[PDB]
Each structure stands twice: as C-alpha cells, then as structure tokens.
Symmetry: C3
Subunit: 466 residues, 3 copies
C-alpha cells in the first residue's frame, strides 16, 4: 500500500492517509432455521449405560427446546435487551437491531412458520415473501428432526429400550451439540448475540449467504476476505420456536460505500512553553477520529470504537457518524481558513502526554517530564524538549513519557513533518479564554475581540471623566 502520515507542528496534530473505506450503511436480514423433532420423554424401561447416555442427551435436547421456548416468549428486544452508551453529545441515537427485530416480529405471526416450512420442504435455501410483503432468504442449517425420528425414536419409544451402539451415542452428541451451544449463547444474552459465532452461522454458511446477497462483486469479495469483521458487525436474533422449527434472524452488515479515501486525525495538546508554573495557555484540536469521503461529503467517526482497521481497509459504521462538508479538511491545511470554522478547545492544563499515530508518535512534553523515543538495540534516539513534537516509527520502537512506556506501531509507511509556528503563540494570554470545553477559531477570536473592546471602552470612559 501507500499509507502516509503528515504531522503539523502548527497545530499539534497528525493525519494518516491512504486508507480505503468500508462503511456500514444498511442491513441485510436473513432467516436461519433448524428442524426439531417433536418427540417426548422416553417411555422406556431401560438400564444400560448406552441407554443412559442416549437418554441424557435427549434430556439435554428437551431442556434446550424448553429454554428456547422461554426465549421466544420475549423473542427480539424491546428495542434492545438494553443498549450501548448514549452517543456523545453531538451524535445521534439509533436502534441497531430494529431491522432484524422487524423481521423477527413477522415470524411470530400465525401461519408464517408454515409458509417457511413449505418453502424448505424440498430445498435448504429458498426465498419467502412474508405477510408484510418483504422477501427474505431462508436457510435450513440443521435437520435434527430427521435424525431423532429415524435413528433414535425407534430405540426409545418401544417400552423395552433397544440398546444403542456406542457410535450412535457419539453421533447423537455430535449432532445435538450445535443446538445446545446456540441455546447457551441465546440464554446468556437475552436472545440477541453479537458477534455472530461459528455456531450461529458457520463459515461455509456465511460465505454462501454473502454470495446470495444483492451486492456487487467487489462488495462480495470484500466481505468474503473479511469474514471476521463481518461477524463483528453482525447480530443473531432469536425469533421463534414452533411447528418443529427453530427460526432466528441473522442481520449482516451492508457495505454501501467502498474504496473511497479515508484518513485519520490524531490530536495532542499544544501548550505554551515559554512561561513557568501556571502562566501557560493551551489549545487542542477536537476533531480527532476517522474521516471517509462519502457521497460528496465527509463521514466523520469521532469514536475510535466504531471503526475497525484491517491493513489499509477501514470498516466504519455510519450510524455513529456525522456528515460534514469537504471543507473540514481545511483544518489540516489552513486552520485559520475562512471557509470552515475549525473546532478547538482550550485550557490551562499544562501536563505531558503522547499519542501513538498510525506510523509515528506525537509527544506533548511540558514542564520537566522525561519524554523520549528509543530503540531496543541502539538506545535513546530522540530526546524531546518542551513543546509539541513528533517522531516517526522508522527506527523507533518505544516512546516513553513520564513513567509511561508506549510501543509504537511498526506498521510501516512514510511520514512527513510540516514545520510551522505553533498557533498558541499567536494568542495574548491575558485575553485568552482558557476554559472552553468545545469552541472554534471564530468563537475564541470573538471572545478575544469582546474582551479587548470592553477594556477599550471602559478606558475611554475613565479618561473622559475629568
């Protein structure tokens, strides 16, 4: 690839370029089914150890079915059970599984299970048009019902217990295990699971489902090569168990935006060094996070949690995002530019830290803190002094600030240092607004203008009073 990075000395920030987008823009819902045996508790006067084992396994099957019935009588969510942390203040709140739960609700209607049974009578992969009009893919991943009714029931519902061969015991355990594990995952998660396990959907099943999705060939390639990330961004929703059938909705991500350029903004505090003790003013860019070009705008992801990087491919999730004009990138070229009100925040908090970037490290070293960049073999190679500086991952293994040792990413590429005057040095510290939790260049310049003009006016008055 060409992963590049730029450090701006003027603003104590860095931008990593060269990444390729994979944005989650929508959802694809599918229905997965397991055929279950009707079957009852064994009427079988039996005493052999193999009979005991088969009966124990049939009890595990029966209890799993019971526990899934309990799960179905509260099936999906109440827009779930529960949700993630309230999005940060600017962002919005969504209902992640509203789509899959909408499908799960339809499955609860009477006669729906019968529609699905009669489309999978002959085959394992069929489309069904539900009552509400939506057509869904429907899979049968496991046929217990056949195995128990043909191999097991003939030996347990006589009254006198045909002794099984040990191979039948082992085989029945093998088949029953997936139902058991699906039920465990559902019971401990209130019927909604993420990520989607290999029990909920195997690799072969997921790849077949991906190949049947209404997406492009490039989208199918991207999803197939990145099954782990897809599982990370998927939900399995318990829906129903009736008519000798278990049905759950699997909700796969839909990567509507692909291959658009992304970049990542890292920010560290930029304080004055020239003064001593509590006389220093600090500003810090606040727009850190991921950016991807998206439909003539920029999709901004401020939480480092909603984006997942493999190599140069950035799988972000549009639900946790803002939409901004392209001019936002001017904050990385001309932070005082007129077209965009670049957002900063201020304080007097004069303490040191370091941010590990994609292929480098930003160090904000203030006061008398030990700030150092070192190599496992050759020793210290860069000794920082007061201010905000940067060191590339080339030839550097660790960055040490205070008593904290950071390892840098040996993910390798080319970084460029853009020398420039720190902008904190352009502000008069007497008229500096040093408690802005969120501000902009225009808002801060506005407050400065106001304070200056008041000093102006009151002095004019105090001179005119002789």
């Amino acid at each position: 690839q060409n992963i590049t990075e730029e450090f701006y000395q003027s603003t104590c920030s860095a931008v990593s370029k060269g990444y390729l987008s994979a944005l989650r823009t929508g959802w694809y819902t599918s229905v997965i089914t397991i055929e279950l045996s009707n079957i009852k508790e064994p009427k079988c006067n039996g005493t052999d150890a193999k009979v005991k084992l088969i009966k124990q396994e049939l009890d595990k099957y029966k209890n799993a079915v019971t526990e899934l019935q309990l799960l179905m009588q509260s099936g999906g969510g109440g827009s779930g059970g529960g949700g993630s942390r309230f999005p940060p203040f600017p962002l919005g709140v969504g209902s992640a599984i509203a789509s899959g739960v909408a499908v799960s609700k339809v499955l609860h209607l009477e006669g729906e299970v019968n529609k699905i049974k009669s489309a999978l009578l002959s085959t394992n992969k069929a489309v069904v048009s539900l009552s509400n009009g939506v057509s869904v893919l429907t899979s049968k991943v496991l046929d217990l019902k056949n195995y128990i009714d043909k191999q097991l029931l003939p030996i347990v519902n006589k009254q006198s217990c045909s002794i099984p061969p040990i191979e039948t015991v082992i085989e029945f355990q093998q088949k029953n295990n997936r139902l058991l594990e699906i039920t465990r995952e559902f019971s401990v998660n209130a019927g909604v699971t993420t990520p989607v396990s290999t029990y909920m959907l195997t690799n072969s099943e997921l790849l077949s489902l991906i190949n049947d999705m209404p997406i492009t060939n490039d989208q199918k390639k991207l999803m197939s090569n990145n099954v782990p990330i897809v599982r990370q961004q998927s939900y399995s929703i318990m829906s129903i168990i009736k008519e000798e059938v278990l049905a759950y909705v699997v909700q796969l991500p839909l990567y509507g935006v692909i291959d658009t350029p992304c970049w990542k903004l890292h920010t560290s505090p930029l304080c004055t060094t020239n003064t001593k003790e509590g006389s220093n003013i600090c500003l810090t860019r606040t727009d850190r996070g991921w950016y991807c070009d998206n439909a003539g705008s920029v999709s901004f992801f401020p939480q480092a949690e909603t984006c997942k990087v493999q190599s140069n491919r950035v799988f972000c999730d549009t639900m946790n995002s803002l939409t901004l004009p392209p001019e936002v990138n001017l904050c990385n070229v001309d932070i005082f530019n007129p077209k965009y009100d670049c957002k900063i925040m201020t304080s007097k908090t004069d303490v040191s830290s370091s941010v590990i970037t994609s292929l480098g490290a930003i160090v904000s070293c203030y006061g008398k803190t030990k700030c150092t960049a070192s190599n496992k073999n050759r020793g210290i190679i860069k000794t920082f002094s007061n201010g905000c500086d940067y060191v590339s991952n080339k030839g550097v293994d660790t960055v040490s600030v205070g008593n904290t040792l950071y390892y840098v990413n040996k993910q390798e590429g080319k970084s460029l240092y853009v020398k420039g005057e720190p902008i904190i040095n352009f502000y008069d510290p007497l008229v500096f607004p040093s408690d802005e939790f969120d501000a902009s260049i225009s808002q801060v310049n506005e407050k400065i203008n106001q304070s200056l003009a008041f000093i102006r006016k009151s002095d004019e008055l105090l001179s005119a009073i002789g």
Copy 2:
C-alpha cells in the same frame, strides 16, 4: 400493553409512556455446591488406550481443582456483590463447610443457617465424588490399572465437563461472572431456586417468565474448595418495585435555523434516559444502557439510579414551570442528527443536510425542513439524515405530536450563554439577566455623560 409516545415540538423531545417497572431493590444469595473427590494423581501402570483416556480426563479434573484452589484465595459508587461476598466470607470460616455438607447428605436442596445468622438455600448440582470413587477409583490407583469401559470414558467426560467449564469461566473473570451462565446454574436449577425463594407470587411469576434478564442481572461468586466440596455463591435480583409507571425520555438538539454560517444558537434537554415511579419519588437511570426491556417491562438496578422529586415530570409538560428547574445545555454546534425513539423518530435537520423518512414501498414519505421534527413508526421504515440511515423501531403503539413554539426562539441570541455544558432554565436566565445588567450599566452611564 398500550405503549404511548408524545413529541414535544417546543423542547425537541419525546416521552414514551406505558411501561411497567421491575427495579432491583434486594439481593437473594444461594450456595451452589459440587461434591468432589479427594483423589491424588493415580499410581496405576496403564499404557492402554482407554486407560490413557481416563488418565487424561482425571488430570483435567485435578488441574481444574488446582486452578480453583489458586482462585479461592490469592451517580454514586458501590459494590454490587457485597451480599454474596458476605456469604462467601462466611463459608471460609471453618465448620460451615461441614454444616452445608451434612445439610445435603441425603437431599439435593436444603436451607442452611450459617454462623452470622443468614438463611440460604444451598444446592448440590453435581457429585463427582461418588462417580470417581465408585466407577473410576476402583479400576485405577491400584497395582495395575484394570481396563475401563468406553461407556465409563464417555460418562466421565460428560460429568467432568460442567466442572471444567465453571473453572474456565471463573478463570477468565477472576472469580466473579455476570451474566450467570447456564454452566453456573441451569434453567431448571434457576427455576427451582426461584420457586423456593421467600418472595411474593408476583415476583416468582416475573422472575420465572424473565429468566434471561435475571441472568443478566445476577452474579456467580467463586467461594471455596474445601472438604471435598466446591462452593460458589449465586446472587439474584429481588425486584422490590413491580408494575409502577416507567417512561423513557429522548432528547435532541433544538437550534435556530436561519440564515447564515455559524450565527445560530442551540439548546438541548439533558435529562434523557429512563424514569420510573419509586416510593413516591422518580428513579432516574441516565445510563439507559443499564435498563433492560422485554415487551413493556423495564428491568433496572436501583444502584445505578438517581432520585428525583415527581415534579421532574413537569419538564415534559411545561419546561418553564416554577417548581422544577429543567436541566438543559446550550451550544452553537448546529449539526444534523436523529434519535430513534420507542415508536418513532426525532430528526434535527440543520444546514445543507438532506433529511428523509421513507417507507419500504412508497419511497420517501417525508422530507424534513430545517429545525426539529418528529415522525411516527406507522408506515415509516427508515429515517435518513445525511449519509446515515437509521431503521426505526417497529414495536406498535400510538404516537401524539404536541405542537408548540420552539423555546430556542424565545431567546435573544445576542445575550445567549452558548457555552453551558451543564445548565438549567434558571441558570441561563440568571446569566441572561446579568449580561443585560452589564449592558444597561454601561448604557445609562454613557447617556449620563451628557
């Protein structure tokens, strides 16, 4: 249940009513036990395949016992497991292990009163002592290793598995696991425990019907391995508040819409989250991540709650009431966003952003103007703001739009305190009045210089 929803246009915020409470006020603790074999590494001379398998499984068991021994001893702020830890510290005191042990010699369910006066159900859930001693100790740990049946191999793996899985769960969770897994306590065991608890039949019905949520809000606490017994404490919620009115507050930014650049002021209700009536007060859950909803039933932990006067609800009906000072934030951040409510969607559309509500068949069914607006989930499937597509909840209910003047209009922007990250109506009013007072001091002074 009749879930209802209201959208206050005046304050850009919605309220979902009709839910019913289940608030955890107490803890019930139970002592789960597994009887074990004092066994040692065996002195058999083996070399057979089935013998090798049984030795492997026995060493799995012995390593699990060793792991559990190395475990057993090695808003506000609270600790959720204080009750269970109290019981666990009781069990470490010598003599109590024998108390439970004799209490379960004959039966598998018992009530035991321990030394510091707590009455706890204790339950033997697995007896590896007797299986190992009667089926698996004879053929092993003598001169040379009589052969086992393959049925014995199968059965010993099947039995040792629960101990092994419990040991793993405790191994990665440092001896405290939540939710309580099915290996710690199966569905049958949990239901029996519930039916034997000293609680109302209302609580028995609620807990029995909502086992997964009970697991969500429970704890398995590793306690002891002594006297050939493994004991852990399971800690279950006691929902001392049931069927009281709960309601959910959703909020979104409310901004001026005209006309140019960054010349707008913004204001947002901050009190969003779950509310439930509780002993003549309102329990507020601000981390609405902590409440779990099944149908119309909201399960919350009161330890994650704040307590408010009932007058807090006035903020929904009249944000300028005298009695309660409604908490808001102010800002200038004029960005488009959307909140997916219980059965609708709030959309705050500002600037060039295109905002839409679409049905899966009719295409777009609403195009939002700049400002704060609402849409019901009747005939709406998705809400699209900018590049973000949200699906709306499809739980059904009735949704009422309460027309009103956006209160951000009532504010003169030239004296608007647009920094207030935590404020209220009256704090903003006080700052507005103070700025006006400074203005008027200067103004009447200069009028007087004539």
Copy 3:
C-alpha cells in the same frame, strides 16, 4: 495489610492508604505454535460408523485450518479521557512480532528451533528474539495414528478409542479457532485454550523479572490473564503460530493510596442559590520512581487484598507535592484541581472502609446497621461514616453496602471551604478548574465590580 483511611470534612474527600503497587510497566511477548498435518480430504470409499465419525472430525479440522488461513490474510492487527491522557496502541508489541512472523523464512527458523525441543529461543529477522513454545503436535497424531486408516482407497476401520482420542486432540485447535474467529484474531483475556495454566506459569518463570515479581504474577494468574492478549499471526508450513502478550510489572510494592471525592455544596435555606465545589482528582495514586503515577479511571485498576494492579498507560506522571492537596487544599506549592456548579443533588461514595455521603435538598440519607436499624440520619452537607458498626448507607431510593474490610479510619474535622467563597463572585460552571483559577476569576469579577461601582459613584 494495614489499610487506613482519613476523611477530610473541609474538602469532602477521603484518602485510603496502605496499598501495594503492581504496575503494568511493560510487555512480554512469546510465540505459541501447534504442529499441523497437511492432509487432503480422505476419499476412502468406506461407510462404517466409526469411519463416518473420523471423517466428520477431519472435516471440522479442515474447516478450522481454513478459518485460521482467512485470519492470517487479514492479520492480527493492522492498526481517551480528556484529562490529557495519552493515546496508546495496546497490542503494538505483539503485532510487531506477528508482522515479523509473516515474512518469508521465519516459519522455518522457528521450525528448525523446535525439532529437538518443545521450547526454544528463536532469533527472527528484525532484531526480535522470542521464546517459542510448541504446545500441541497434531501433525504427528494425524499422520501416524489416523492417515493410514483413512487414505487407502478402502479405509481400514478405526477402533472407537481412536475416534474419541482424535476428538480430544482436535478440541484445542477448534476452540482456539473459534476464539479467534469472533474476535478478529485478537482475544483478551487470554483463555486456558490459548494458554493453559501450567504453560502460563512456565512462561512466567522464563520472564526477565525478579523472583518477587514472579511470585506476584504466579499468585494472581487471573489478573495476568485479564491483562494479556493473544494475537493470531500465521498458519503455514504445517505450523500454526500466535503471539502471546503478557503484562510486565516493573514496579511493585510501592505505596498506593486512593482518593475519593464528593460534591461539597452550601446548605443554606433558599433554592438552587447554592454554590458547589468538588475535587476532580479522584482515583489511584502510586509512588513510582520519585514521582506519583496517577490513575484517574479507577476502572483500569484491579484490586486483590491490598494489592493494586494498575496499567501505566492510563496514568499521568505527577510531582509528589500532589499529595499535599490532601493536607492543605490551599497550599501554594501544588495547584489543586476542582470543579464548580450549582448542581444540587445527593450522592454517596463507598470508600475502602467507610462511606462519604453528600446529602443536599430534601433527601432521606441514612446509615443503618443490620441489627439495630438507622444509626444515623444525615443532615444537609457532606459527612462521613465509618464501617465500624455500619452496614448500609441509603440515599434516596438507592441502597449502598459499606465495605466491611477491617482497618482504621480517622475523621478529620474542618470547616467546609465552600463557605469561604462569596456566592456572587463564585465561578459556578467550571468543568475543570483549580484553586488558583477560581481565585483568578473571583479577583477579576471583584475588580470589575470595584471599578464599575466606584466609577458610577463619583458622578456627582
């Protein structure tokens, strides 16, 4: 373990002393390997039930190998609080080792290291020298015990013991693959499948630490597992290799103390006409190489007995004089960090051996003993109760349980400093301020009132 506690009425805060540090100062990485058989699909034309079971298990093995192959192509890793806290890269070390392992010829380096032995130090290319372990040899069992049975154009019938034993051996590979597949190749905590308990203990023995540190890690294996990563690296050349990244506790046994804070508001009669002040420096503090390591997110720190396992990457380095904020809040050497508001609601903080209660407004705030009932009804303000005869603390509809840990606590009487502040000069919405910054704003507002009022007074 002498846990002591002091409550400071003047500042509505409390310090619990008497703890011992265990700080994650660094990382230790090693490479774990499993030997795998190549094996193609068997194609033996037999249909005995045991043959069926063997071929099913081989299919599970084959799909596991394919899932690991996919995870290799993606790679293990291809890569917050505002108090300026740094932004690290947790698995950068292990990912560096994995990156090296991807290169041509490194697999054969480890393979040649591990023919004669099961544990050996390998020198890979980029100046990395890693301890390598071989923890399962599936290639030998498959190629000796299984392959003759099943690759013969007419498969010999296996004994049932072979079916069961193959399931036993294949289990660990299957479980490791399952863990990796739902975590995108990076799992934490490190499970007993990734690294069993005896394996982890041996790896601990072969770390470059003092025997005291080895004892500490081996006695708190659950904490070590919680603080460790397993990074899938490669499957190729009949070898599966994944990197294990263990915490490295370079600082242990130094003094640690925890600071708890609670809002300190004015009790007076009227309204939200109160001023409120709160120390913002809650969290853990540990002496560290002549400085104080500060952990503001007390979330990041585990506590076992009086030992505090913290991670330095969630910490700030502070001068020792920070502790002076616990003695004189107004001392000039260190500038104590506070916050202010008018926000009037009651809360309670459970300390190590007590409870701070900030009871404001018309709230029922009580402290109860389980056998005696309510033993204190808190009056409006900030107060403290010790666990000596106190079991629970109830504020509003919320019931907190007090820590019953044995120790001694000292109530330190003093005048609440919120009373020193004039409620009209008071800067009452400061999200993150200091004593000095509040004094600065108060002086500025006072000066404005002085000038404005005297000015308009002299206009006779």
